Ligand binder design. Structure first.
Ligand SMILES: *[C@@H]1O[C@H](CO)[C@@H](O[C@@H]2O[C@H](CO)[C@@H](O[C@@H]3O[C@H](CO)[C@@H](O)[C@H](O)[C@@H]3O)[C@H](O)[C@H]2NC(C)=O)[C@H](O)[C@H]1NC(C)=O
Ligand SMILES: *[C@@H]1O[C@H](CO)[C@@H](O[C@@H]2O[C@H](CO)[C@@H](O)[C@H](O)[C@H]2NC(C)=O)[C@H](O)[C@H]1NC(C)=O
Ligand SMILES: *[C@@H]1O[C@H](CO)[C@@H](O[C@@H]2O[C@H](CO)[C@@H](O)[C@H](O)[C@H]2NC(C)=O)[C@H](O)[C@H]1NC(C)=O
Ligand SMILES: *[C@@H]1O[C@H](CO)[C@@H](O[C@@H]2O[C@H](CO)[C@@H](O)[C@H](O)[C@H]2NC(C)=O)[C@H](O)[C@H]1NC(C)=O
Ligand SMILES: *[C@@H]1O[C@H](CO)[C@@H](O)[C@H](O)[C@H]1NC(C)=O
Ligand SMILES: *[C@@H]1O[C@H](CO)[C@@H](O)[C@H](O)[C@H]1NC(C)=O
Ligand SMILES: *[C@@H]1O[C@H](CO)[C@@H](O)[C@H](O)[C@H]1NC(C)=O
Ligand SMILES: *[C@@H]1O[C@H](CO)[C@@H](O)[C@H](O)[C@H]1NC(C)=O
Ligand SMILES: *[C@@H]1O[C@H](CO)[C@@H](O)[C@H](O)[C@H]1NC(C)=O
Ligand SMILES: *[C@@H]1O[C@H](CO)[C@@H](O)[C@H](O)[C@H]1NC(C)=O
Ligand SMILES: *[C@@H]1O[C@H](CO)[C@@H](O)[C@H](O)[C@H]1NC(C)=O
Ligand SMILES: *[C@@H]1O[C@H](CO)[C@@H](O)[C@H](O)[C@H]1NC(C)=O
Ligand SMILES: *[C@@H]1O[C@H](CO)[C@@H](O)[C@H](O)[C@H]1NC(C)=O
Ligand SMILES: *[C@@H]1O[C@H](CO)[C@@H](O)[C@H](O)[C@H]1NC(C)=O
Ligand SMILES: *[C@@H]1O[C@H](CO)[C@@H](O)[C@H](O)[C@H]1NC(C)=O
Ligand SMILES: *[C@@H]1O[C@H](CO)[C@@H](O)[C@H](O)[C@H]1NC(C)=O
Ligand SMILES: *[C@@H]1O[C@H](CO)[C@@H](O)[C@H](O)[C@H]1NC(C)=O
Ligand SMILES: *[C@@H]1O[C@H](CO)[C@@H](O)[C@H](O)[C@H]1NC(C)=O
Ligand SMILES: *[C@@H]1O[C@H](CO)[C@@H](O)[C@H](O)[C@H]1NC(C)=O
Ligand SMILES: *[C@@H]1O[C@H](CO)[C@@H](O)[C@H](O)[C@H]1NC(C)=O
Ligand SMILES: *[C@@H]1O[C@H](CO)[C@@H](O)[C@H](O)[C@H]1NC(C)=O
Ligand SMILES: *[C@@H]1O[C@H](CO)[C@@H](O)[C@H](O)[C@H]1NC(C)=O
Ligand SMILES: *[C@@H]1O[C@H](CO)[C@@H](O)[C@H](O)[C@H]1NC(C)=O
Ligand SMILES: *[C@@H]1O[C@H](CO)[C@@H](O)[C@H](O)[C@H]1NC(C)=O
Ligand SMILES: *[C@@H]1O[C@H](CO)[C@@H](O)[C@H](O)[C@H]1NC(C)=O
Ligand SMILES: *[C@@H]1O[C@H](CO)[C@@H](O)[C@H](O)[C@H]1NC(C)=O
Ligand SMILES: *[C@@H]1O[C@H](CO)[C@@H](O)[C@H](O)[C@H]1NC(C)=O
Ligand SMILES: *[C@@H]1O[C@H](CO)[C@@H](O)[C@H](O)[C@H]1NC(C)=O
Lengths: 123, 422, 121, 118, 120
């Protein structure tokens, strides 16, 4: 579905960086969205999830007080604003579709339509 | 699939139901909604009928009764320049009436129509008024009128009215162009017996409506897309006089006629009624075979209220004769008679007296539809005959309420979701 | 935005977002008073029936009654995206009284369980 | 059935509250009767609402029981009494209890208003 | 203890303590019309509170922020220095916007709670 990250790729420790996802091949407002983090050599971990309407956000405890995830159904845009980035946050951040659905949709609890991944390095 | 019941309130579901409607005196379109309508099972018609009967009966209660009348009276031929058509139709009658004092009497003369009088063999009298052996006659109050002021029927809260906007809707079956209203449009309670006056026009062609198009016992409602202007008139400058018949009870009667006496005639244009009947036949041929030659005929005999077309004009209650219309094998002037003692709703016991209205009465009505009764005998031939006819006076309101249905809203419902409580 | 019943022909999912528009229109000489009393009685019976189920004060109420496949075996996609509330209501005719009874019994058990949980010191 | 548990003990009658419910809501005399039934239902629902018990049939409160209202233990109250006898026994204190219930709710919402203001 | 409307001339932060006194006082053809219209006004107010998610409460906090364009005042002057009648006059013809915002906020809250309760 050509889900493409347009975020930055170089920040100093203690700074802030914004990432975003653009979608074109599917109805953006019909799917939940998430960010999944892959540190080099450590595999992947889930970082954050947002609902299809954008009203609900969920985080891992390690970022709950630092990251804000938001979405705009107009212009089909997902955003993640990361404050107080740490050396442990150096990773490839992938956009993913799904991981949640509303009560009127079938269950997912899985990630599909992954983006290509933005590389975020903390010096 | 691990699904749980979720309860919703405010659900857009409704069921067919009938209830009491408000009489007053916006539209929201429903996309992808197909509703089943049936104008012959629509209780808005029965409620409108009962409401009009109630208003009619209440209007005549605080009015003058004519029980001081219904006496023998001596009638003679009216002395004037009377044409042949009016011979025997108007009589100059005299009687002994009461006054505001119990023990006084006065000799009063007035002009009555022959249809209001029945012969009686007695001494010093030769006639009596009709509806004096049975029922009783109440004079309509002169301070009120019979103008068909439009009214609106509004559903109560919790109910809605569905309106069918299909241009060719025939009064029954599914309707795809549906809107929701709280109140109907203004409906004029126009009272007529054979033609439908001052009603709604069809958007296209002519709409033929019948509960059972093959059952001769059902009426056929014909709604035109164009009106036919009927011009009627009573060309006689009647002078109206009044007397007191009791302590505060005044009786109104025709005093005299200024000028010559002529009939009350009503004109139907040939250049519109012709081709209007052609359109009606063209649409009747959509239900009957193409090889059948549809003819029209005057109605059969019977009571005057059903054999004649009795639209109210102004205040007089004209009873036009429609033998000049519906006579073909597919300017017209028709002799329009009058009357004053009227059994309005085919009832015995509530006779009303319509007081004469001063001067000349010249009405201009729009014919928007008509009632056909077919041949009745259903002759197995190709010469199907349509006679005009009347009914129980509810078809005049079916012609306007055919597009409305009352439904009850069912805001509560259930559906499966993945939402478990706790 | 769509009006009183504008969502009647829309899907159940889309129509579920217009509940307040219809809820506001349920409340607003002897026969006029009879009509008003009938409207009040219908409203109060519906509010009471929601109260029995523990749904009072909510327009969307989640419950603890599982859905039976014998009532309707359609998946959520077909029910919510390809069906209207009128067609759904027709589909679940003859089953609403069973659902109502199960909801009443479930709420009675919920009230007893909450009372016992609140009785622990 | 409706009022079937009136002669049962309160411990058993408290499980039929939905049976006793629904029978409270369903020419001028019939209309006056309907309006009176609606008025009594709404007065009872408002009285529950001002106590913080809206939407519930069994509502627990924060008003302690005063032994001067009744000195019976729970076993005697719930297993050996019907609701009619209990209602007769404590009728003379019912309005006092209602007042206390109202007062508790008057405090409770204020406390919640403060807790949500943090 | 002040009675019906006894706090009407008191400040908002004092009159707000007597809401139950006002609430308990809200409940032949002419007599039935008066009783039915009183019932209809009560039910419309209760339905309107229910739509906002405030059913069963007299003091109901919501998630609608206060706009400075509705009343550019601080809490001290609103609650301690003016009455509810003056406040009601001051925010006349702004209440319909507030009511619409409350309705939309409750609809969003109900959808969010349903989605939260739909997580396994
Ligand atoms: C169908 O509609 C037409 C037009 O609305 C009706 O004609 C109208 O009838 C009213 C009442 O009969 C007339 O009002 C009268 O006006 C005179 C004016 O001098 C007044 O003196 C009377 O007291 C009364 O107010 C009105 O003039 C007349 N309109 C026209 C354009 O002629 C017609 O009666 C309706 N059809 C039927 C069958 O009732
Ligand atoms: C109806 O009859 C009455 C009496 O029979 C007529 O009244 C009389 O009319 C003549 C004129 O022909 C006068 O000279 C008399 O003085 C009238 N008498 C009374 C008591 O009024 C009346 O004119 C007749 N009307 C018509 C239209 O023929
Ligand atoms: C109206 O009443 C008058 C009298 O009040 C009637 O005229 C009288 O009729 C009687 C009948 O017995 C005659 O003996 C009198 O000679 C008549 N009076 C006069 C002055 O000649 C009259 O017949 C009544 N008319 C009607 C139609 O009832
Ligand atoms: C009351 O009088 C009317 C006439 O004013 C009577 O009408 C009769 O109707 C029958 C048909 O059923 C006719 O054959 C008669 O000729 C009519 N009478 C007259 C005098 O023309 C009516 O029958 C009377 N009412 C009752 C109950 O007998
Ligand atoms: C009066 O009119 C009737 C109507 O038919 C007629 O038969 C009668 O001869 C007329 N009498 C006079 C005197 O003109
Ligand atoms: C009316 O129209 C419906 C449209 O389907 C048709 O089925 C029905 O037979 C028609 N009835 C008459 C009497 O024309
Ligand atoms: C339904 O009626 C309205 C009346 O304004 C019209 O605009 C609309 O096009 C009609 N729709 C159909 C499908 O006939
Ligand atoms: C009325 O219907 C006839 C049927 O053919 C048509 O010719 C005529 O133009 C229509 N008139 C209007 C005003 O729609
Ligand atoms: C009309 O009535 C006759 C009576 O036998 C019946 O056979 C026919 O089917 C009916 N038609 C309709 C359209 O209802
Ligand atoms: C009816 O037509 C005739 C024909 O000449 C005419 O004399 C009369 O005045 C017309 N009346 C009306 C009311 O149009
Ligand atoms: C009826 O009278 C009007 C005058 O208002 C006239 O314009 C019209 O042509 C007449 N129509 C008929 C059919 O006589
Ligand atoms: C009858 O004639 C009309 C005139 O156009 C035509 O449309 C219709 O199909 C004909 N009916 C039959 C059964 O041939
Ligand atoms: C109408 O006029 C015709 C003309 O001859 C007549 O045959 C018919 O009986 C009249 N109608 C009535 C109801 O008198
Ligand atoms: C019906 O039309 C024919 C056609 O000539 C005519 O002879 C006959 O008199 C008309 N009927 C009436 C009642 O005028
Ligand atoms: C009828 O005659 C009277 C005589 O005074 C006159 O005032 C009135 O205007 C006339 N009316 C008509 C309609 O000719
Ligand atoms: C009668 O039809 C004419 C034709 O245009 C129209 O202008 C007029 O308003 C109509 N009158 C009524 C009362 O329907
Ligand atoms: C009616 O159906 C069409 C199907 O394409 C849909 O797009 C439209 O939104 C529906 N109407 C409403 C009011 O939702
Ligand atoms: C569904 O209904 C049937 C009817 O007998 C019942 O046996 C079954 O247990 C029900 N399903 C559940 C999950 O309770
Ligand atoms: C729901 O059921 C229909 C009919 O069996 C099927 O076509 C559709 O794919 C199903 N959808 C899901 C999400 O299971
Ligand atoms: C409900 O029962 C009736 C009884 O005949 C039946 O016709 C109808 O189809 C049933 N409903 C469903 C959804 O099957
Ligand atoms: C009445 O009392 C007897 C005493 O044994 C008991 O068994 C019975 O259940 C009671 N009735 C009811 C309705 O509980
Ligand atoms: C219990 O009631 C008595 C009087 O009935 C009262 O004096 C006492 O204070 C009450 N108990 C408490 C704890 O307030
Ligand atoms: C309750 O009080 C009564 C006093 O008659 C006593 O007999 C009974 O044993 C008491 N119950 C308990 C559980 O203490
Ligand atoms: C309630 O009070 C009345 C008189 O005030 C008294 O007769 C009655 O016995 C009292 N009730 C109880 C249960 O003590
Ligand atoms: C009226 O105003 C005075 C001014 O201080 C205040 O003390 C008093 O309490 C007010 N009245 C009420 C009922 O609060
Ligand atoms: C409400 O606040 C927004 C910004 O929060 C502002 O743009 C809007 O104009 C305010 N409302 C009014 C009625 O001015
Ligand atoms: C509130 O605003 C008024 C307006 O002048 C001011 O006098 C007052 O001191 C303010 N109070 C607070 C607590 O900010
Ligand atoms: C809105 O309310 C304010 C409050 O005083 C008032 O001044 C203003 O005129 C109102 N708006 C309108 C359009 O009347």
């Amino acid at each position: 579905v050509q889900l493409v990250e347009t975020g930055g790729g170089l920040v100093q420790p203690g700074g802030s960086l914004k990432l975003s996802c653009r979608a074109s091949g599917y109805t953006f407002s019909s799917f939940a969205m998430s960010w999944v983090r892959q540190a080099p050599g450590k595999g992947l971990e889930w970082v954050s999830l947002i609902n299809d309407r954008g009203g609900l956000t969920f985080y891992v405890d390690s970022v709950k007080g630092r990251f804000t995830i938001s979405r705009d159904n107009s212009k089909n845009t997902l955003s993640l604003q990361m404050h107080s980035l740490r050396d442990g946050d150096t990773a490839v951040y992938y956009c993913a579709t799904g991981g949640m659905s509303s009560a009127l949709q079938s269950s997912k609890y899985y990630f599909d339509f992954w983006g290509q991944g933005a590389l975020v390095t903390v010096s | 699939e691990n699904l749980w019941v979720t309860v919703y309130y405010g659900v857009p579901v409704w069921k067919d139901a009938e209830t009491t409607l408000f009489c007053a005196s916006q539209e929201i379109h429903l996309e992808n909604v197909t509703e089943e309508f049936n104008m012959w099972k629509n209780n808005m018609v029965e409620q409108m009928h009962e409401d009009i009967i109630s208003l009619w009966d209440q209007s005549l209660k605080p009015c003058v009764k004519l029980t001081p009348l219904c006496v023998g009276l001596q009638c003679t031929n009216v002395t004037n320049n009377i044409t042949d058509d009016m011979r025997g139709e108007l009589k100059n009658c005299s009687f002994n009436a009461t006054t505001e004092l119990r023990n006084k009497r006065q000799k009063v003369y007035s002009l009555f129509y022959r249809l209001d009088i029945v012969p009686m063999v007695d001494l010093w009298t030769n006639y009596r008024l009709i509806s004096c052996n049975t029922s009783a006659i109440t004079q309509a109050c002169p301070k009120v009128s019979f103008e068909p002021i439009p009214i609106h029927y509004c559903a109560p809260a919790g109910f809605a009215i569905l309106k069918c906007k299909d241009k060719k809707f025939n009064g029954t079956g599914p309707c795809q162009n549906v809107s929701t209203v709280q109140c109907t449009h203004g409906i004029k309670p126009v009272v007529s017996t054979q033609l439908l006056l001052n009603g709604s026009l069809a958007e296209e062609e002519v709409i033929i409506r019948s509960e059972n198009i093959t059952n001769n016992a059902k009426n056929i409602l014909v709604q035109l897309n164009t009106s036919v202007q009927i011009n009627c008139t009573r060309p006689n400058n009647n002078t109206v006089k009044s007397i007191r018949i009791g302590p505060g009870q005044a009786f109104y009667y025709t005093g005299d006629i200024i000028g010559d006496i002529r009939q009350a005639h009503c004109n139907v244009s040939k250049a519109t009624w012709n081709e209007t009947l052609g359109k009606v036949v063209k649409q009747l041929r959509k239900h009957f075979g193409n090889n059948t030659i549809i003819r029209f005929a005057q109605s059969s005999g019977g009571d005057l209220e059903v054999t004649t077309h009795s639209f109210n004009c102004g205040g007089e209650f004209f009873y036009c004769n429609t033998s000049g219309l519906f006579n073909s094998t597919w300017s017209i002037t028709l002799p329009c008679r009058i009357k004053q003692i009227i059994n309005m709703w085919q009832r015995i016991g509530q006779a009303m007296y319509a007081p004469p209205i001063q001067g000349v009465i010249r009405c201009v009505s729009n014919i928007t539809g008509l009632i056909l009764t077919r041949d009745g005998g259903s002759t197995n031939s190709t010469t199907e005959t349509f006679r005009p006819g009347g009914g129980d006076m509810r078809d005049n309101w079916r012609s306007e309420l055919y597009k409305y249905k009352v439904v009850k809203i069912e805001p509560l419902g259930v559906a499966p979701t993945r939402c478990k409580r706790r | 935005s769509l009006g009183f019943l504008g969502a009647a022909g829309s899907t159940m999912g889309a129509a579920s977002m217009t509940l307040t528009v219809q809820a506001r229109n349920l409340l607003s000489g002897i026969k006029q008073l009879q009509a008003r009393v009938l409207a009040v009685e219908h409203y109060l019976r519906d509010q009471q029936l929601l109260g029995i189920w523990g749904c009072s004060g909510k327009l969307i109420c989640c419950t603890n009654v599982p859905w039976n496949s014998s009532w309707s075996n359609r998946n959520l996609s077909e029910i919510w995206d390809n069906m209207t509330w009128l067609q759904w209501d027709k589909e679940i005719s003859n089953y609403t009284q069973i659902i109502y009874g199960l909801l009443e019994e479930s709420q009675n058990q919920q009230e007893k369980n909450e009372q016992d949980l609140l009785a622990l010191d």
